[PDB]
Design a protein around this ligand. Structure first.
Ligand SMILES: Cc1cc2nc3c(=O)[nH]c(=O)nc-3n(C[C@H](O)[C@H](O)[C@H](O)COP(=O)(O)OP(=O)(O)OC[C@H]3O[C@@H](n4cnc5c(N)ncnc54)[C@H](O)[C@@H]3O)c2cc1C
Ligand SMILES: Cc1cc2nc3c(=O)[nH]c(=O)nc-3n(C[C@H](O)[C@H](O)[C@H](O)COP(=O)(O)O)c2cc1C
Ligand SMILES: Nc1ncnc2c1ncn2[C@@H]1O[C@H](CO)[C@@H](O)[C@H]1OP(=O)(O)O
Length: 610
């Protein structure tokens, strides 16, 4: 519970703003859109601002009508089980319990979601419906951006109709030109001590480690083990062990660990080199809006090298607004036109953006090379690029067995992009290079989750996790094996695992063998998808054991667990539908419902990513 800021409406009256855009973001996307809509206001004769709903008290909404033509927009993303982002929790809870009258309040909502999840854009739908219930009036249709297809285009399309509608309603009109959020200040005699070198929180935070640790103050865990898990060479699957000794950090199997990686130093040098810039200049980007709490786009003062290395996203396909602001720096007319046309909501521009940038997975350097006429000043490129995000990983260990260590199970990302070059995953390439024992350190923190073992050690457990999904279950199994070692009475523990071949990527083959032999694993059912002509998937095994699984489900009150990358989860879900439908019996419909009831009742947990 942080100390809230004073009334945002009052802050709006002072700074002469009529529109405010809050963001429910966790990975930074929502925030990105919020900031974009906020600036937009200016091109329509209005002034706006974006804000973190956590730092404010949304009850002040009822005072928004005090401002003429005032308007409020919410860019909210959803997380696991249609839940709000951590930073939208206060607002969510408030909407639930409040009875405040929002008469005269004009609002609009854009939801960031992903059609593959159960509760698609639940947060958005809820905010949009709740505000109308409290008596506020919708000024524009609810937006349903789908990250499965292309969220960016969903935002453009929505946005392209949003502003005209706002103008129409408030009787305003168009006016643009390039505007910078920050101002460059080159520091010359800057004492080193006052220069950020990659820390996230306070100056020298990574060196002077003082608890508690978290996203703002990550703990640098030393890598004590980094081994290759797969036997073959098709891909690289590694096992890392981070030592959290004296971190006073607690965790449970099923939780996630987040890490702050470093971009590929050569990729960084090249961006600098090709821009003809000196990545070693010490500078600061100071907000030209002396009112905003966001003093800088990222920790300052610091160097461009450090910025591009630890604070900036330099590998993900740039969004239309970035390519739009950059077109101004392409001396070649044709290249300026393409970059400029990227933000179209249809036609050749949209197509070009979709295939040549997105489908092509062209990162910022690639575009600079494939458009040699584009040479933006380094300082402006840093204001435009998004913030490098922490990457999450399901802890592959139990604290009951490994309280001072956090395990990670991951497959290094490296692929051939249609863009012509070989793209490398940021966090994984970085993790792969971490050699134990010059102490390989990894800035990280733990995030609690709702993917947990059952409370009663007797409850049956069904773990479905193909490929790397086997990650959280390695901790589950250790812990369960541990419960049997501690004389506790443990119910059946079944693992439904999958890989291509037992001689290629059969993860933890030995360990898993140990547990089965010692009885920790009641069943070790493994589906090798490529050892025969047809695919043998984990769900094929669930179908095979329908009779038994049903007995554990319907009578043993067993808990179902699904992990993996993200199509797979759906298949597994339908298999459970058909299992229940045949053994109930019952229609497909009452089956889907049965399995759905199990999810709400906490007996079917999901942990799928990307
Ligand atoms: C909750 C949660 C738990 C997770 N748990 C784990 C885990 O336990 N183990 C694990 O291995 N991962 C896990 N992840 C995934 C992890 O967070 C990262 O997404 C993954 O490690 C890749 O990150 P990176 O920085 O290495 O690569 P990035 O730089 O993040 O690149 C990732 C992007 O590469 C692109 N890409 C990948 N392959 C291709 C391709 N061949 N063609 C075109 N584009 C492609 C995709 O857009 C993908 O999003 C989890 C994710 C979440 C959210
Ligand atoms: C762990 C996790 C859980 C998610 N759960 C949901 C969900 O329940 N419903 C949904 O529509 N989208 C879900 N998504 C997708 C996000 O809503 C979507 O990627 C959004 O663009 C993220 O925005 P942000 O970067 O601003 O947080 C999830 C993503 C992750 C990583
Ligand atoms: N739809 C699906 N359902 C269950 N497993 C799947 C799946 N699609 C792929 N897999 C398997 O997930 C495992 C880890 O990536 C691999 O064995 C992969 O098999 P495949 O690669 O031969 O299709």
């Amino acid at each position: 519970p942080p100390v809230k800021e004073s009334s945002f409406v009052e802050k709006m009256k002072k700074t002469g703003r009529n529109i405010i855009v809050f963001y429910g973001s966790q990975t930074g996307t929502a925030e990105e859109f919020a900031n974009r809509l906020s600036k937009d206001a200016h091109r329509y004769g209005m002034r706006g601002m974006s804000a973190d709903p956590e730092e404010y008290d949304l009850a002040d909404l009822s005072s928004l009508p005090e401002i003429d033509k005032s308007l409020v927009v919410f860019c909210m993303a959803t997380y696991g089980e249609g839940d709000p982002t951590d930073n939208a929790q206060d607002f969510y809870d408030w909407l639930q319990e409040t009875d405040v009258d929002l008469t005269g309040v004009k609002f609009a909502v854009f939801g960031l979601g992903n059609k593959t999840y159960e509760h698609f854009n639940a947060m958005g739908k809820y905010v949009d419906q709740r505000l109308e219930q409290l008596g506020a009036q919708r000024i524009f249709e609810l937006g349903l951006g789908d990250d499965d297809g292309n969220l960016e285009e969903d935002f453009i399309t929505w946005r392209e109709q949003f502003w005209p509608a706002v103008c129409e309603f408030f009787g305003v009109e168009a006016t643009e030109s390039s505007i910078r959020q920050y101002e460059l200040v080159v520091h010359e005699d800057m004492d080193v001590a006052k220069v950020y070198t990659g820390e996230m929180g306070r100056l020298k935070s990574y060196e002077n480690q003082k608890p508690p640790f978290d996203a703002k103050n990550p703990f640098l865990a030393a890598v004590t083990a980094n081994r290759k898990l797969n036997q073959g060479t098709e891909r690289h699957l590694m096992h890392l062990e981070l030592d959290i000794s004296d971190s006073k950090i607690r965790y449970e199997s099923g939780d996630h660990v987040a890490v702050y990686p470093a971009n590929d130093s050569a990729l960084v040098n090249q961006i600098g080199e090709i821009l003809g810039a000196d990545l070693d200049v010490i500078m600061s980007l100071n907000n030209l809006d002396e009112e905003s709490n966001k003093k800088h786009p990222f920790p300052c003062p610091t160097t461009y090298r450090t910025a591009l290395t630890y604070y900036l996203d330099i590998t993900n396909p740039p969004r239309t607004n970035v390519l739009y602001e950059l077109a101004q720096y392409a001396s070649e007319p044709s290249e300026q036109e393409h970059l400029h046309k990227m933000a179209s909501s249809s036609g050749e521009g949209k197509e070009l953006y979709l295939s040549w940038v997105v489908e092509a997975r062209r990162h910022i350097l690639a575009i600079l090379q494939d458009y040699p006429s584009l040479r933006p000043p380094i300082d402006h490129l840093c204001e435009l690029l998004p913030r490098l995000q922490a990457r999450y990983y399901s802890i592959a260990s139990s604290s009951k067995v490994h309280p001072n260590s956090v395990h990670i199970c991951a497959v290094a990302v490296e692929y051939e992009a249609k863009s012509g070059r070989v793209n490398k995953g940021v966090a994984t390439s970085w993790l792969r290079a971490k050699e134990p024992a010059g102490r390989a350190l990894v800035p990280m923190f733990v995030r609690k989750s709702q993917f947990r073992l059952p409370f009663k050690s007797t409850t049956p457990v069904i773990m479905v996790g193909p490929g790397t999904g086997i990650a959280p279950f390695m901790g589950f199994i250790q812990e369960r094996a541990w419960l049997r070692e501690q004389g506790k009475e443990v119910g059946e523990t079944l693992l439904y695992y999958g890989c291509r071949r037992s001689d290629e990527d059969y993860l933890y083959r030995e360990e898993l063998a140990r547990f089965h032999k010692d009885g920790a694993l009641t069943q070790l059912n493994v589906a090798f998808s490529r050892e025969q002509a047809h695919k043998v998937y984990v769900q094929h095994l669930l179908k095979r054991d329908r009779e038994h699984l049903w007995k554990l489900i319907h009578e043993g009150g067993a808990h179902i667990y699904v992990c993996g990358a993200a199509n797979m989860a759906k298949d597994v879900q339908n298999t459970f539908y058909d299992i229940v439908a045949e053994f109930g019996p019952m229609e497909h419909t009452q089956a889907v419902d049965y399995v759905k009831k199990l999810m709400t009742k906490g007996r079917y947990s999901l942990d799928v990513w990307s």
